[PDB]
Write a protein that binds this ligand. Structure first.
Ligand SMILES: CO[C@]1(C(=O)O)C[C@H](O)[C@@H](NC(=O)CO)[C@H]([C@H](O)[C@H](O)CO)O1
Ligand code: NA
Length: 163
């Protein structure tokens, strides 16, 4: 397709602004992480269906981090954005996406990091204001595609219905 660049392999990269990174994860764990090394350490974790409240250890920026997670859905996987604002602080959970297609997306735009939230097939976007956002390197731990912001409606379609 001429709309979607990829797939590309798990890697560390500094994406251009105004491009969605469409992520295609497999198993539960850390999907993608990125930081500005100032006041924003961001990551997205993935929870399989049917997970009772439990502590799980995630490797975030080379560190074992214990987070209290759950997924009450029996059919949908759960993407959760995690954020800490100081090097020595705690991660809080934001902007969950309950997903049937198991796809996620992230984008750098207007001094923010955008992601998807809600429940498929009616997902919407959300964002996190990020200092010096151009320095933000990301490490994807799964295969990904690239889609221009101009084609955001198609990205939303993929989030909601799959490829
Ligand atoms: C300050 O306000 C904002 C932000 O502009 O960043 C608004 C944004 O909607 C919100 N997004 C969501 O909650 C989910 O997308 C985000 C977030 O709560 C914090 O950045 C977490 O530190 O806060
Ligand atoms: Na989200």
């Amino acid at each position: 397709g001429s709309l979607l660049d990829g797939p590309y392999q798990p890697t560390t990269f500094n994406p251009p602004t105004s491009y969605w990174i469409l992520l295609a994860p497999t198993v539960e764990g850390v999907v993608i992480q990125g930081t500005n090394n100032i006041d924003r350490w961001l990551a997205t974790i993935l929870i399989e269906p049917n997970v009772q409240t439990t502590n799980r250890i995630y490797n975030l920026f080379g560190q074992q981090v214990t987070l209290s997670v759950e997924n009450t859905s029996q059919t949908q996987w759960k993407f959760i954005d995690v954020s800490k604002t100081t090097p020595t602080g705690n991660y809080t959970q934001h902007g969950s996406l309950f997903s049937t297609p198991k796809l996620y997306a992230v984008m750098k735009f207007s001094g923010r990091i955008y992601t998807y939230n809600g429940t498929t097939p009616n997902a919407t976007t959300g964002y996190y204001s990020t200092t010096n956002y151009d320095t933000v390197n990301m490490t994807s731990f799964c295969d990904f595609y690239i889609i221009p912001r101009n084609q955001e409606e198609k990205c939303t379609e993929y989030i909601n219905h799959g490829l």
